[PDB]
Amino acid sequence: GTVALREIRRFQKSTELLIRKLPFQRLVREIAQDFKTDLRFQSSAIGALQESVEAYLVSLFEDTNLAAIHAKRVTIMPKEIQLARRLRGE
Amino acid sequence: ETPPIVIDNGSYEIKFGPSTNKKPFRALNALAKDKFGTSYLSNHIKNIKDISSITFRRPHELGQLTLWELESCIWDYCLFNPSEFDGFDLKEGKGHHLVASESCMTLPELSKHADQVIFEEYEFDSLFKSPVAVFVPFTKSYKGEMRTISGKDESDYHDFQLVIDSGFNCTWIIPVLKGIPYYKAVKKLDIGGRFLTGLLKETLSFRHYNMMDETILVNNIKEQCLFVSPVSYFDSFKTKDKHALEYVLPDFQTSFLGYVRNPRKENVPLPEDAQIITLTDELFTIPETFFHPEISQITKPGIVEAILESLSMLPEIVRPLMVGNIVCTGGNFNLPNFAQRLAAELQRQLPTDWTCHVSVPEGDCALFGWEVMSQFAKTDSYRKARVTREEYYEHGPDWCTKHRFGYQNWI
Amino acid sequence: DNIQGITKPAIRRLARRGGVKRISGLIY
Amino acid sequence: KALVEEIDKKTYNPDIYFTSLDPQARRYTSKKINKHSFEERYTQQEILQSDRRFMELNTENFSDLPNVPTLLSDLTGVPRDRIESTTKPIYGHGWVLKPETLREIQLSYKSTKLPKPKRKNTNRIVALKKVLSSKRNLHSFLDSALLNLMDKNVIYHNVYNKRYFKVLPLITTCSICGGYDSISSCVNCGNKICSVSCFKLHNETRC
Amino acid sequence: IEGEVVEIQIDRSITGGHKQGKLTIKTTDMETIYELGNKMIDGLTKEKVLAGDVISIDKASGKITKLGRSFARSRDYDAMGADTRFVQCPEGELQKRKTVVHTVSLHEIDVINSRTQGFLALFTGDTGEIRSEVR
Numbered sequence: 025g026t027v028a029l030r031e032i033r034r035f036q037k038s039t040e041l042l043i044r045k046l047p048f049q050r051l052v053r054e055i056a057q058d059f060k061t062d063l064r065f066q067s068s069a070i071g072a073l074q075e076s077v078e079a080y081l082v083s084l085f086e087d088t089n090l091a092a093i094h095a096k097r098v099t100i101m102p103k104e105i106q107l108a109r110r111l112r113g114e
Numbered sequence: 115e116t117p118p119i120v121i122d123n124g125s126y127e128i129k130f131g132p133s134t135n136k137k138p139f140r141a142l143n144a145l146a147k148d149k150f151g152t153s154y155l156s157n158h159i160k161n162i163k164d165i166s167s168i169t170f171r172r173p174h175e176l177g178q179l180t181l182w183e184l185e186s187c188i189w190d191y192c193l194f195n196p197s198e199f200d201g202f203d204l205k206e207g208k209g210h211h212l213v214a215s216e217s218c219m220t221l222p223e224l225s226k227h228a229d230q231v232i233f234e235e236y237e238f239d240s241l242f243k244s245p246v247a248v249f250v251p252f253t254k255s256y257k258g259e260m261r262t263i264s265g266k267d268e269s270d271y272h273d274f275q276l277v278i279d280s281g282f283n284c285t286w287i288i289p290v291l292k293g294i295p296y297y298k299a300v301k302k303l304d305i306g307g308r309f310l311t312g313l314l315k316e317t318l319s320f321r322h323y324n325m326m327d328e329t330i331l332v333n334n335i336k337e338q339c340l341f342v343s344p345v346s347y348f349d350s351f352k353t354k355d356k357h358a359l360e361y362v363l364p365d366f367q368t369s370f371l372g373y374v375r376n377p378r379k380e381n382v383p384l385p386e387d388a389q390i391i392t393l394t395d396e397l398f399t400i401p402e403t404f405f406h407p408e409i410s411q412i413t414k415p416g417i418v419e420a421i422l423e424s425l426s427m428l429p430e431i432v433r434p435l436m437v438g439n440i441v442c443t444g445g446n447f448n449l450p451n452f453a454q455r456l457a458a459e460l461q462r463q464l465p466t467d468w469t470c471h472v473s474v475p476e477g478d479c480a481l482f483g484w485e486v487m488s489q490f491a492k493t494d495s496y497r498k499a500r501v502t503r504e505e506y507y508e509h510g511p512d513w514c515t516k517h518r519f520g521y522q523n524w525i
Numbered sequence: 526d527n528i529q530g531i532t533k534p535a536i537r538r539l540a541r542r543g544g545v546k547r548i549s550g551l552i553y
Numbered sequence: 554k555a556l557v558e559e560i561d562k563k564t565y566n567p568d569i570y571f572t573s574l575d576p577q578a579r580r581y582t583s584k585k586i587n588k589h590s591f592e593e594r595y596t597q598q599e600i601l602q603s604d605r606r607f608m609e610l611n612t613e614n615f616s617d618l619p620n621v622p623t624l625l626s627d628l629t630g631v632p633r634d635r636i637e638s639t640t641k642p643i644y645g646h647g648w649v650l651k652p653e654t655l656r657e658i659q660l661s662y663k664s665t666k667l668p669k670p671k672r673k674n675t676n677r678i679v680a681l682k683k684v685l686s687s688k689r690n691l692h693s694f695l696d697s698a699l700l701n702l703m704d705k706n707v708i709y710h711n712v713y714n715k716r717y718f719k720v721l722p723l724i725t726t727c728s729i730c731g732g733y734d735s736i737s738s739c740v741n742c743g744n745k746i747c748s749v750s751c752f753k754l755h756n757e758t759r760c
Numbered sequence: 761i762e763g764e765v766v767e768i769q770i771d772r773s774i775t776g777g778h779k780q781g782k783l784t785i786k787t788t789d790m791e792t793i794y795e796l797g798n799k800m801i802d803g804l805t806k807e808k809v810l811a812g813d814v815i816s817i818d819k820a821s822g823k824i825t826k827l828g829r830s831f832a833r834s835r836d837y838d839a840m841g842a843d844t845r846f847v848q849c850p851e852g853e854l855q856k857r858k859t860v861v862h863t864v865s866l867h868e869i870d871v872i873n874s875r876t877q878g879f880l881a882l883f884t885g886d887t888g889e890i891r892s893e894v895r
């Protein structure tokens with residue numbers, strides 16, 4: 025059979041946080057240098073930030089996907105993103 | 115050597131034997147190689163220790179065979195290994211004739227290939243190849259066991275006949291009249307052993323863990339644990355809760371083949387570590403696809419429609435004759451209750467005036483057809499209907515496949 | 526000057542996380 | 554009906570009765586709302602999909618999954634371009650000619666052997682050698698003129714049905730399980746569902 | 761068959777289909793689509809029924825019992841002026857199997873089988889010496 029695998033190992037589909045650790049860390053140190061030069065980033069408490077940012081993003085894509093299906097279209101234009109930004113309140 | 119050698123070449127397994135024997139010699143017709151490269155011949159597939167991940171190749175496709183290399187090698191294997199197949203022994207088979215069974219819808223070019231490969235390499239002397247259909251009428255020549263089931267109630271070869279074969283490749287329905295089968299009312303059903311195994315895979319995948327790479331388990335399960343709905347789809351569904359079977363995974367460390375158990379019987383109380391798959395619905399739902407192909411959402415008409423239309427092509431005078439004597443042939447027909455179910459269905463479809471009867475050979479129909487062909491070799495009409503070496507030599511390979519055994523000639 | 530560190534396939538799987546396999550050319 | 558009812562003379566279609574909670578208050582056909590052979594009930598696309606599902610049920614291994622276009626082209630003579638474009642589907646692959654098995658078969662029959670030479674050198678022998686090293690595809694059989702067109706006609710249309718495609722009624726039971734009572738069609742996917750568990754299992758992947 | 765109905769769609773008479781009608785049913789856990797078979801539409805058009813309420817329909821009997829008005833949103837049915845028998849809320853699944861028990865006296869059976877319409881005589885009291893063969 026070719027379905028039961030997709031039934032017994034697909035009882036648990038989760039998906040994960042993805043933004044790469046080293047590039048993200050380099051980026052945040054880069055935008056932290058100008059705010060305060062020689063800012064030593066503690067290697068802890070950065071996973072919590074790197075989960076919170078992704079959470080807010082996936083909220084933004086779910087809102088823009090709702091807006092997209094509201095426009096009978098699957099692709100994303102800048103209009104959806106900017107109105108999501110404005111209507112959320114920032 | 116007066117008695118020929120009878121070869122019923124099957125797409126799944128071939129049946130080779132001397133005309134003297136009463137039972138054929140069974141040899142697989144396939145090639146399965148382990149993923150590590152150690153290939154194994156067809157007869158040696160059953161002795162392997164792992165069946166989880168194999169690469170398969172079967173020379174006989176849906177229609178017929180194209181490349182004769184593997185078939186020639188397997189024919190030599192069953193013709194030049196007296197040790198593995200006891201009793202049989204041969205040097206050249208020069209004076210030995212050949213009795214073969216090949217389909218009536220063969221490709222004329224492929225028929226020429228078969229004729230040349232059987233004659234001009236192994237150096238035969240006389241050949242006779244014809245579909246398994248025409249020989250079954252010869253059942254009136256020799257006494258045998260033949261269970262005739264009535265649809266309505268709750269020379270020597272028989273001119274009137276209508277026979278259905280259902281093997282691994284596909285299904286063929288043939289009308290035979292005057293000993294000369296009709297080649298236009300013939301109808302082919304694509305549901306064969308392959309398609310039933312595929313449906314089994316899909317429906318277990320709808321129920322229990324996948325095995326799509328492991329097809330030998332599929333074939334064994336299909337041969338073992340299925341049974342045809344005795345009365346109807348719904349009433350057989352009412353038995354799904356009460357009746358159920360349980361198969362156990364074959365642990366290569368412990369047992370190369372698994373087993374099926376019934377919870378009612380306590381003769382096997384031994385617990386086992388491996389996982390057990392419960393089959394409660396697919397035992398009877400699977401055979402139903404012949405009468406209801408649309409269960410698997412196909413546009414295929416069905417068996418009953420096929421036989422009805424094949425009867426419709428036949429002339430009206432000969433139409434009632436065929437249904438009065440029907441013989442069941444093929445390895446798929448060994449499924450229990452299939453013959454009675456199809457008999458009830460077509461008798462219900464056919465009107466009241468004519469009563470149709472279905473004759474079942476007990477057990478598998480493969481050995482029944484093989485012993486029928488052996489009787490044909492015994493039957494002396496084969497002497498008058500045979501050909502010689504000088505006939506093959508004086509003409510070309512095209513004449514032998516286009517005049518005597520050609521199918522357009524008998525159309 | 527490493528804002529471009531976040532690669533395009535990262536954005537594509539970020540969109541895949543939120544559903545809909547449709548992705549524009551400047552959503553990144 | 555309750556006697557004496559008020560109507561406003563507008564619309565008032567006695568055979569049209571539409572009632573909802575009014576979340577959209579739109580007819581499904583207000584203005585074309587959008588944007589017995591089985592070959593008739595099921596269109597050409599549907600019967601071709603049934604056919605390619607049939608051929609994909611024919612195969613017993615991974616390797617023949619890309620062999621489906623070749624097999625279907627051999628069956629009905631359709632180029633592989635439209636097979637790969639419109640079907641929308643779900644050395645062991647290249648026939649049995651591996652030399653490894655060719656030399657391994659020697660150990661298969663090595664228990665007893667007594668071969669002798671009896672052969673000549675003629676055109677028939679050359680053709681026998683060609684057949685022995687066959688390595689041919691059904692596509693090569695059909696493209697070449699080695700088989701008569703009348704043979705193609707009597708091998709292709711001697712099997713198909715053309716007038717009666719169904720003689721028994723269809724059960725039309727749920728796809729997942731076989732709940733035979735209180736069957737119903739789904740809201741979106743349009744496939745019959747029977748049980749709550751069946752709907753839960755169907756709404757995720759099949760629907 | 762029980763649950764909240766949310767929309768009925770009814771078509772005209774067409775060559776392809778005598779009547780193309782569909783019903784949508786919402787339970788506490790399931791939403792499903794039913795197709796009408798050219799008769800029960802007369803059932804729902806005999807009396808003015810409307811969506812957004814819990815109804816009970818029997819597969820074999822074919823009777824439609826409107827139990828009142830569903831719960832859905834409180835405001836939508838909080839200004840109807842009482843009525844609807846204190847509304848209702850869907851409880852379980854779509855279809856189940858239940859048992860109906862009817863208690864009847866024997867004399868009621870003789871009165872019922874005595875005449876064409878004896879259940880009227882069960883109130884008017886004009887049975888009139890039912891024959892012994894009936895008993």
Ligand SMILES: Nc1ncnc2c1ncn2[C@@H]1O[C@H](COP(=O)(O)OP(=O)(O)O)[C@@H](O)[C@H]1O
Pocket residue numbers: 123124125126127280281282283284307308333336337338444445446448449478480
């Ligand atoms: N007792 C049985 N129950 C169910 N299926 C069976 C039984 N015996 C044989 N079969 C099936 O019949 C098929 C054998 O077909 P076969 O006669 O080899 O066709 P061919 O002659 O065209 O090769 C096998 O695939 C096997 O699964």
Ligand code: BEF
Pocket residue numbers: 123124125279280281282283284444
């Ligand atoms: F060659 Be078979 F029995 F289909």
Ligand SMILES: [Mg+2]
Pocket residue numbers: 122123124125281
């Ligand atoms: Mg065979």
Ligand SMILES: [Zn+2]
Pocket residue numbers: 727728729730731732746747748751752
């Ligand atoms: Zn189901």
Ligand SMILES: [Zn+2]
Pocket residue numbers: 739740741742743744755756759760
């Ligand atoms: Zn659905």
